[PDB]
Design a protein around this ligand. Structure first.
Ligand SMILES: *[C@@H]1O[C@H](CO)[C@@H](O[C@@H]2O[C@H](CO)[C@@H](O)[C@H](O)[C@H]2NC(C)=O)[C@H](O)[C@H]1NC(C)=O
Ligand SMILES: *[C@@H]1O[C@H](CO)[C@@H](O[C@@H]2O[C@H](CO)[C@@H](O)[C@H](O)[C@H]2NC(C)=O)[C@H](O)[C@H]1NC(C)=O
Ligand SMILES: *[C@@H]1O[C@H](CO)[C@@H](O[C@@H]2O[C@H](CO)[C@@H](O)[C@H](O)[C@H]2NC(C)=O)[C@H](O)[C@H]1NC(C)=O
Lengths: 645, 289, 48, 215
């Protein structure tokens, strides 16, 4: 008899659209399917809507949707895990599965007019209220302002409904105030445990008229460098002209959270042509510390503090560069984008993430596998290198080691990383696999991506595989799913996939087939891979000048600001003096940090593959359950299991 | 203000979501201008130096400038209505020049300071009018008035408590200055009074399939029914297994189905329909149901 | 053991009704301290 | 300045004319402006099904691929643009017909080459995929592929790629240098003794383009 299947994400969210995928395998004729969502534990019934019919014309497919509400009954438990169980009725054969629920309801972003304020001045702030899809949502938000030690002084409650997801508000700082760090904390009404925050500073200041840039030649220090650390000083007025003055620069060592200062590293250099240069020699460093060992210096970090004064003597700026690592290798290799599960007897792809010591991606560094020197590759623009091996049918874990081959650098300077992969386990050791292979490039919307599906099984069962079943996971929900038909003898099939703005910032492609093999046993084989998309806006907002001449306008002069953007969007503006950012550029919001928070909320924990078909879906973030009995592994934790590191 | 403005713009689209645009920079500048750099605050009735910076960005022209500090009824200097405090200075090309002045604050508050300058042989001039805070001598103190425990059951007796907060004496307060009284309340979180529950390690064996006669069916149904209720209130399904509650629901529902087969037509229960009804077993099912 | 849990005994019995009589005395600031606000901070500012 | 009905001109000059029956086939479609300049981001589609579309890349080439059935009959190929707002009469189209690969005595033993299609710059690595297609009674005799690189009328590089039994698909990383400019062809072949003791040689080739730059 045919097998019915329900596919849903690992974790369901309140107050958001949740995709529900229903399929029947090897089915004959139509089959009506009714949908029902129950509470867990107990039976109170939270949703009874939606039904569909799986049709052989649609290859027994049907996607339906639902939305999980939030009331006083749902919002009761705030600190511990609770769950709801959706039951699916395929004709008369019912299939049901318990699903994890997340109490999160969306995202909150807070913008302020400045990063640092004066007592007795006004604070302007706007809160953008979006759901998990980054679209404007209308909900009630609770905002609080806390003092340096965490005392709420002012609190708000307001709905953004009919305001296009923007809450413009304001508040005045009294003169009686404790200067220091102040934090704005906010949370939705229907999700009080998911709290957002951003900080600002209160100080008695005046804006300087010039900026001081401290530029190390390399954002790291190599211990055995005889010359030592070279730091270039760059200074210019806020309007873009070169500064003439004299600087006092000092160095120090940072060990954990505690900072140690080197008193004798002090230097005094004039700043000429808007620039200066100071060098901290290796001998001075060894003299600063009381430890003559250079090996103990590895893993610690340096910081630079510069005090610059104009030759007019009327202004002064203090700038700091910190966190400069003391390491043996100018690079850091990571298998973070490489799957940890290989397919025995099938080629396996290696996505190596090589970075600079600070954490920035390294560009065009040639890395190679430790085994065999012939296999090398240079890293792409995002710091990812493509390597591949020809695996043997070994059921024993396979050790993988990658080592950079950058010229001129010594072997001690070459970064390296070592891991051990795990074998894919088939049903009853049938040695029937599915292999996914996909191009590795910076993917921009408007391009097509060819997904390659490779089938592996004895040809006695190859005629029984007439289709593949694939799904796309993006931002914690199912974006797209379908079938790819296959005729006998076509083990490899190609599916062009068009990348749109919805696939940003990253998505996972899962696929599986099923049949009755071995001695009459249902078998499900799966595979997955995680893909990255280039950081950009969904739309496109551009701000430029309307005038094409009259460079450097006059104070008070009228000028035209030109804003190009998608039709129908609401734009908010703020113009700030760059001197405020020279004093404090922290907490500046940007589009990249927005995609950073989205990736940190992802429920997927693995760059694809898995120990088995159940681990493929469970690692991707999906739950699977069939009428036969095969189902995904149980998961009761919102977070991802922590690597050993 | 003469500086480079950084314009941050964020867009909100109902179809294309939120978008943070790249910051846009507008550099506002004048070829010749002044910058009066005041301290944030100044103490009342103490002579201080102010620094006015005059910029000339000609590439081959030095400028003869008449710079003047204007009269002020809130500050004392050489500038009076009859006698102006003016200087004549020269600024080399591609350079800056600072002209210091000495003044004395005379009255508290955000008071006003104005300076002007004009060059000879060119009609290019600039003026700067800024305000800075005149602060009387003293310093901030954050002393505590009182910290006490509230307990109406314990203090005041019979569930009612009343207490006063005397005002701070603060004899060192600066005359006619603000003074805030900050009141904070925080409850006392009291927890515990709970004993440990059974860890459900060895409780996985109580899942029994009902079978046999009516009383035998109740024997098999007995442990499975209470176990799900115990695991629900102890919320130990994480360790026990979420999938096992759905399986137990089938067995409990199956036991309820088989139990009704031994029901007497008078709504009584026994091991068989032939056997006389058992009053104890009838009460046991009611307790179970 | 289930009846021990379920409505498991706990130490919290918070039911505090706290009110203040201000020197302005245009109104009496009054708040409630229950369990959900057990460790909640309440702060007020006067300008004198 | 051309007088035409369509703002585009489609050409199969860069498209292979021979498909493998029962094996996926790649289509490299060359779409240009009427003058001869490459068109950018115009969506062209296969005549069969409007859902299979792809936008043209920077060099005026569009990537399409089909999954051929083991049909020994020639396959009709028609490509047609689906640019929005423009009417169907304004959409360019081109029609050709491909021919099936003929094995030794129609033994149905094939070799399939597949390669990424992007603007290739020297200094990056390219994964070459070798797919064997034959009945698995003879699959154990194919232990390697033999490949060569043709560039500027001479052999640039050649070598062997080993293969283990049961691994019909193998991957060979190839590093692209300035010597591969401007374009190169990759040929590959395997050999064995099959049928009743008869030598069989099957071959395959593919053409690759490199981005314009100096050596
Ligand atoms: C008076 O106000 C100060 C703030 O101006 C507070 O003390 C601060 O406490 C934090 C710890 O949370 C320290 O990091 C600061 O350095 C402290 N500031 C000081 C000592 O000036 C507190 O409200 C009061 N402190 C004193 C000493 O009166
Ligand atoms: C799930 O079903 C919905 C039906 O509402 C599908 O949405 C339609 O998809 C077709 C083809 O992609 C479009 O032509 C329609 O315009 C869509 N509907 C609307 C209202 O625009 C959706 O594509 C299905 N998704 C999956 C993965 O099967
Ligand atoms: C053909 O033979 C030449 C011998 O000159 C090979 O070139 C050598 O390749 C090795 C690769 O391991 C290099 O280390 C040597 O430096 C090369 N020789 C010289 C003189 O530089 C070449 O690889 C062989 N194969 C082909 C396809 O040319």
């Amino acid at each position: 008899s045919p097998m019915y299947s329900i596919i849903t994400p690992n974790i369901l969210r309140l107050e958001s659209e949740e995709t529900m995928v229903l399929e029947a395998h090897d089915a004959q004729g139509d089959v009506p399917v009714t949908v029902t969502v129950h509470d867990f534990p107990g039976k109170k019934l939270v949703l009874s809507s939606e039904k569909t019919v799986l049709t052989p014309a649609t290859n027994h497919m049907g996607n339906v949707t639902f939305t999980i509400p939030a009331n006083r009954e749902f919002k009761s438990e705030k600190g511990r895990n609770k769950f709801v169980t959706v039951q699916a009725t395929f004709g008369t054969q019912v299939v049901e599965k318990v699903v994890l629920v997340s109490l999160q309801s969306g995202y909150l972003f807070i913008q302020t007019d400045k990063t640092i304020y004066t007592p007795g001045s006004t604070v302007l702030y706007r809160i953008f209220t979006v759901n998990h899809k980054l679209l404007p949502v209308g909900r009630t938000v609770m905002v609080n302002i806390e003092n340096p030690e965490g005392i709420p002084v002012k609190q708000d409650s307001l709905s953004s409904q009919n305001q296009l997801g923007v809450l413009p508000l304001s508040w005045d700082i009294p003169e009686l105030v404790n200067m220091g760090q102040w934090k704005i904390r906010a949370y939705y009404e229907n999700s009080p445990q998911q709290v957002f925050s951003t900080e600002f500073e209160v100080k008695e200041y005046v804006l300087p008229s010039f900026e001081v840039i401290v530029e190390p030649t390399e954002k790291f220090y190599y211990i055995y460098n005889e010359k030592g650390l070279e730091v270039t000083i760059t200074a210019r007025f806020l309007y873009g002209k070169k500064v003439e003055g004299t600087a006092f620069v000092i160095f120090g060592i940072q060990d954990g959270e505690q900072r140690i200062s080197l008193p004798e590293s002090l230097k005094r250099i004039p700043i000429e042509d808007g620039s200066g240069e100071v060098v901290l020699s290796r001998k001075v460093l060894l003299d600063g510390v009381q430890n003559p060992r250079a090996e103990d210096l590895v893993g610690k970090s340096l910081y630079v503090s510069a005090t610059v004064i104009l030759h007019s003597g009327s202004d002064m700026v203090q700038a700091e560069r910190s966190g400069i690592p003391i390491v043996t290798s100018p690079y850091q290799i990571h298998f973070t984008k490489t799957p940890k599960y290989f397919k025995p007897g099938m080629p396996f792809d290696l996505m190596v993430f090589v970075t600079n010591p600070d954490g920035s991606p390294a560009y065009r560094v040639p890395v190679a596998v430790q085994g065999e020197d012939t296999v090398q590759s240079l890293t792409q623009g995002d710091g990812v290198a493509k390597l591949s091996i020809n695996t043997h049918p070994s059921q024993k874990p396979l050790s993988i080691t990658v080592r950079t081959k950058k010229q001129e650098l010594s072997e001690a300077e070459q970064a390296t990383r070592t891991m051990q992969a795990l074998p894919y386990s088939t049903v009853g050791n049938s040695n029937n696999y599915l292999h996914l292979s996909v191009l590795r490039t910076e993917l921009r919307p408007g391009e097509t991506l060819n997904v390659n599906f490779l089938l592996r099984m004895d040809r006695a069962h190859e005629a029984k595989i007439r289709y593949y079943t694939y799904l796309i996971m993006n931002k914690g929900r199912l974006l797209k799913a379908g079938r790819q038909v296959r005729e006998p003898g076509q083990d490899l099939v190609v599916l062009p996939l068009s990348i749109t703005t919805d696939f940003i910032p990253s998505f996972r492609l899962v696929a599986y087939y099923t049949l009755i093999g071995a001695s009459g046993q249902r078998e499900v084989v799966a595979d997955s891979v995680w893909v990255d998309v280039k950081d950009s806006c969904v739309g496109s907002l551009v701000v430029k000048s309307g005038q094409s001449e009259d460079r450097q306008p006059v104070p008070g002069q009228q000028m035209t600001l030109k804003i190009e953007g998608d039709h129908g969007a609401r734009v908010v503006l703020v113009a700030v003096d760059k001197g405020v950012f020279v004093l404090n550029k922290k907490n500046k919001l940007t589009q990249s940090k927005i995609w950073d928070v989205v990736e940190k909320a992802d429920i997927g924990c693995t760059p694809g593959s898995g120990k088995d078909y159940a681990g493929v879906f469970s690692d991707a973030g999906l739950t699977f359950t069939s009428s036969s009995g095969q189902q995904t592994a149980q998961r009761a934790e919102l977070q991802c299991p922590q690597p050993a590191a | 203000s003469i500086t480079t403005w950084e314009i941050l713009a964020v867009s909100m689209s109902d179809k294309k979501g939120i978008c943070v645009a790249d910051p846009f920079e507008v550099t506002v500048m004048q070829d010749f201008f002044i910058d009066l750099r005041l301290p944030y605050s100044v103490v009342r009735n103490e002579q201080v130096e102010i620094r006015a910076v005059l910029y000339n960005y000609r590439q081959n022209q030095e400028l003869k400038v008449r710079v003047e500090l204007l009269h002020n009824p809130a500050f004392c200097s050489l500038a009076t209505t009859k006698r102006r405090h003016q200087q004549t200075v020269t600024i080399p090309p591609k350079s800056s020049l600072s002209v210091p002045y000495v003044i004395v604050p005379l009255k508290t508050g955000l008071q006003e300071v104005e300076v002007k300058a004009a060059v000879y042989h060119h009609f290019i001039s600039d003026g700067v009018r800024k305000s800075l805070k005149v602060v009387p001598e003293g310093i901030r103190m954050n002393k505590t008035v009182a910290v006490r425990t509230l307990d109406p059951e314990r203090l005041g007796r019979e569930g009612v408590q009343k207490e006063d907060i005397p005002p701070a004496d603060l004899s060192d307060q600066v005359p006619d200055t603000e003074s805030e009284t900050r009141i904070l309340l925080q409850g006392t979180p009291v927890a515990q009074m709970t004993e440990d529950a059974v860890d459900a390690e060895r409780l996985k064996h109580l899942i029994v399939t009902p079978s046999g006669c009516g009383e035998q069916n109740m024997i098999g149904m007995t442990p499975t029914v209470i176990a799900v209720h115990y695991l629900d209130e102890t919320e130990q399904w994480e360790k026990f297994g979420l999938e096992k509650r759905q399986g137990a629901l089938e067995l409990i529902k199956k036991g309820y189905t088989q139990q009704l087969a031994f029901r007497q037509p008078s709504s009584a229960f026994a091991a068989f329909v032939k056997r006389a009804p058992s009053t104890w077993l009838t009460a046991y099912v009611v307790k179970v149901f | 053991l289930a009846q021990y849990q379920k409505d498991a005994p706990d130490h919290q019995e918070l039911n505090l009704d706290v009110s203040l009589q201000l020197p302005s005395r245009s109104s009496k600031i009054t708040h409630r301290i229950h369990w959900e606000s057990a460790s909640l901070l309440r702060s007020e500012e006067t300008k004198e």
